[PDB]
Design a protein that fits this description.
The structure is a homodimer. By secondary structure, chain A is α+β, with helices and mostly antiparallel strands. Chain A contains 10 helices and 19 strands. In chain A, strands 4-5-16-13 form a 4-stranded mixed β-sheet, with helices on both faces. The longest helix of chain A has 19 residues. The structure holds protoporphyrin IX containing FE (HEM) (2 copies), ligand KLA (3 copies), 5,6,7,8-tetrahydrobiopterin, chloride ion (3 copies), gadolinium atom and zinc ion (3 copies). The PDB classes it as oxidoreductase/oxidoreductase inhibitor.
Chain lengths: 402, 404
């Protein structure tokens, strides 16, 4: 009574036995599938803890031993005395890697074991927080040879407010409302841009203005910090055989670093745990630049390419989009900044799926997000059936602190 | 009532129709199985309950619920089943149920046309040679010398005891696939099995990679006999590219008429195991799926070689470039031959229009995001950023076991 899982390109079949351990409930019922939706005490804290502790001791091939019963005994003791408990550093590193490994919308998970974990649980203020973040950005960027990392700030605890990063990513471009009712810059960042303005930030008027950080220390208003310009590596976009493309003035940043997700580890919650990797070329080329509700350059490129934009049957959109993706890959390589194309990315995810079936008996995966947004069926994940479910440790969405 | 958002426009609706879904799918709160190709996995009291539901909405959709012939039609079905254990549909109900089953098909992107469907009633047929006639009429009326017209031919329903009408081919028009001396295929690998059956039931195999298969038609209880489609009834399109003159020399073609012939049509608790339907192609079905899938004709690297694309590295996006040109060639060829076809941008925008229509008429529309989104340029279409609810409504097309 585990689902059978077939790859239709190759004929392979597997059964997802891991989905039986799913430690939460999604939005789907037997009546109706909702897989496509973007947004799907002392005693329950104990069972999440116990399960996580059991997980940690399995991966160190020491389950059911002395140390295991001891650590299980310590935790309930501490939840009795304090209502919560503290992770050992090795548990935190393991918990943070498992969270990534468990993330169903991440096609990058072949890398989940190479994860640099920064322990900032001793963080005291918004100023210390900022220093940790610049240290993350510096390490992760590594002058173009990008490295995966995560910085863990102190956990939610009774008595104190949360540490929160208000920015959805550490590096984002401003989006300014215009006189045409429009947006100058990035329309997805209009709200945080208006929050930065009303917290003292003096805005620019360009299209690639890097936003300041809004950092919230517990029970403190958010404080504004400017990223030093030398810290944010950017890549100017040019096309290898379309020379007028460099005159569009387009840039993107090197480091994708998600900063508004909640990391959950054995019942403990970390509302601030930014993590960073490296880009897959379609996130920039296809989503960031071509989404109509983003930078929306697709017609401008196609017009410049002297394509026939009157009729859809000329496939001008598909043609413009492909060259924009080509320009992004060429540009990042010319600048020596790590980037993976959607063909290499999805081929390695398939290797991740086979590695995960042998170790855990399955792999949580959200097909609508794993398949790339152009050339879907040209990649090997298209023809692969996938099972989506929530394991813990996990990264979860959380409401905006404003 | 699930909230459903469109993330490119920001608009919000609620799907009230979903709650009126009955036959449960494969998902649970514990795990989503939306990506599976086969969800459902394949005392006449329950015939009456499906029959009365079907008659009720038949009478709702024409304002004539409460008083009138609506009362009287409910009694006739009652008596019909109490007498015979089954029942027969009025020709208007059969027409209505076929349009509903198309309208309810969650994977169909071309449902804006759901109201314009020619329904040939083939229920009074009792012969495989007769089936061949009906199929050949359908193909002629559907093809229409290239000006394609949606159509379905409804063969007799499954009756309790005694056999079943069935079409063994997956579609009415299929190319052969010939195994070799190394296990590779000449022609269409998707059809290596049914080609094997045609050979063992009589067919002399053919030349190469675009041989139209013979039909395999099964009258109830009798074995499937072969039938040979007359070549002038099978309109094909030789694929050329407008500016890549060598593309014609590749010798690729495709047929005009996509006609599915292995699905079961369910109306009012009745089942029609043979009910072949047809429409016209969306261009990516041919160029991207049939020609470019690795387990299909797999021509992608051949086209890239001739375009002198850097096949040494994936980062050149050579697969994306070749695929777009193959889709361009399909579109150009079909238009030159004046065979109805629709590109995936025109189709998905027609579907968004369908969704709004269906919002106002029924409070939503069942849609399968995985299949509605085209297989190239997905996020460039307006359906990509549209959240969608998948559920099962009746009437419906359903998968069924293969007759072997
Ligand atoms: C280093 C290479 C990485 C690559 C190539 C990568 C790629 C991606 C992509 C492409 C997506 C979805 C966006 C899309 O569909 O276009 C995604 C989602 C995600 N990734 Fe990865 N990622 C990487 C590193 C990481 C790391 C280091 C973590 C956590 C420690 C992580 C956690 C996540 C999460 C939680 C999501 C879902 C985000 C959401 O739902 O908003 N990823 N990743
Ligand atoms: C009129 C033009 C039509 C177009 C453009 C069209 C397009 C499509 C497409 C693109 C798919 C999914 C296959 C893919 O995306 O590669 C599909 C599936 C489907 N269509 Fe439509 N179709 C049309 C007519 C019809 C008609 C007339 C019927 C029935 C009366 C129908 C019933 C279905 C069904 C049942 C499926 C699901 C097939 C399956 O699950 O195997 N379609 N259609
Ligand atoms: C570490 C990392 C590396 C990488 N290379 N890529 C990513 C994913 C970035 C990404 C992609 C998306 F497609 C959408 C988002 C945010 C959308 C979600 C949806 C909810 F609204 C909250 N934020 C973020 C993360
Ligand atoms: C009338 C019509 C028009 C059109 N334009 N397109 C179609 C769909 C053709 C099609 C496309 C697919 F992508 C897959 C299938 C069959 C899939 C499942 C797998 C099972 F084996 C049985 N059917 C059929 C039908
Ligand atoms: C149906 C669907 C499928 C899919 N595969 N993908 C999407 C887009 C998901 C997405 C990606 C993003 F990158 C950003 C958003 C908007 C969410 C944030 C949260 C705040 F509200 C501001 N916008 C949504 C939608
Ligand atoms: C595994 C995956 O769900 C399956 O291959 C589906 C995905 N979406 C599809 N979409 C279309 N249009 N046609 C298909 O055959 C498929 N196959
Ligand atoms: Cl991004
Ligand atoms: Cl112009
Ligand atoms: Cl087909
Ligand atoms: Gd040039
Ligand atoms: Zn589901
Ligand atoms: Zn998008
Ligand atoms: Zn395919």
């Amino acid at each position: 009574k585990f689902p059978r899982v077939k790859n239709w390109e190759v004929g392979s079949i597997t059964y997802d036995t891991l989905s039986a351990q799913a430690q939460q409930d999604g939005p789907c019922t037997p009546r109706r599938c909702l897989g496509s939706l973007v947004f799907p005490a002392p005693e329950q804290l104990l069972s999440q803890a116990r399960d996580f502790i059991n997980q940690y001791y399995s991966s160190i091939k020491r389950s059911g031993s002395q140390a295991h019963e001891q650590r299980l005994q310590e935790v309930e003791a501490e939840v009795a005395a304090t209502g919560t408990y503290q992770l050992r550093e090795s548990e935190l590193v393991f918990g943070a890697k498992q969270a990534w490994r468990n993330a169903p919308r991440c096609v990058g998970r072949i890398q989940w074991g190479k994860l640099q974990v920064f322990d900032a649980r001793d963080c005291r203020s918004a100023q210390e927080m900022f220093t940790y973040i610049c240290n993350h950005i510096k390490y992760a960027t590594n002058r173009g040879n990008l490295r995966s990392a995560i910085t863990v700030f102190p956990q939610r605890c009774p008595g104190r407010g949360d540490f929160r990063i208000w920015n959805s990513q550490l590096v984002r471009y401003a989006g300014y409302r215009q006189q045409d009712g429009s947006v100058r810059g990035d329309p997805a960042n209009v709200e945080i841009t208006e929050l930065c303005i009303q917290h003292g930030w003096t805005p620019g008027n360009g299209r690639f203005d890097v936003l300041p950080l809004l950092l919230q220390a517990p029970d403190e208003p958010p404080e504004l910090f400017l990223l030093p310009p030398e810290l944010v590596l950017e890549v100017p976009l040019e096309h290898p055989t379309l020379e007028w493309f460099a005159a569009l003035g387009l840039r993107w940043y090197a480091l994708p670093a998600v900063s508004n997700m909640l990391l959950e580890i054995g019942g403990l919650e970390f509302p601030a745990a930014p993590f960073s990797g490296w880009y897959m070329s379609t996130e920039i080329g296809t989503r960031n630049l071509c989404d109509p509700h983003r930078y929306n350059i697709l017609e401008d490129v196609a017009v410049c390419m002297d394509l026939d934009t009157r009729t859809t049957s000329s496939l001008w959109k598909d043609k413009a989009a492909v060259e924009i993706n080509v320009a992004v890959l060429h540009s990042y390589q010319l600048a020596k900044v790590t980037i993976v194309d959607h063909h290499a990315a999805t081929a390695s995810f398939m290797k991740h799926l086979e590695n995960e079936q042998k170790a855990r008996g399955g792999c949580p995966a959200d097909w609508a997000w794993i398949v790339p947004p152009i050339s879907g069926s040209l990649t090997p994940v298209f023809h692969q059936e996938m099972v989506n479910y929530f394991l813990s440790p996990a990264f979860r969405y959380q409401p905006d602190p404003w």
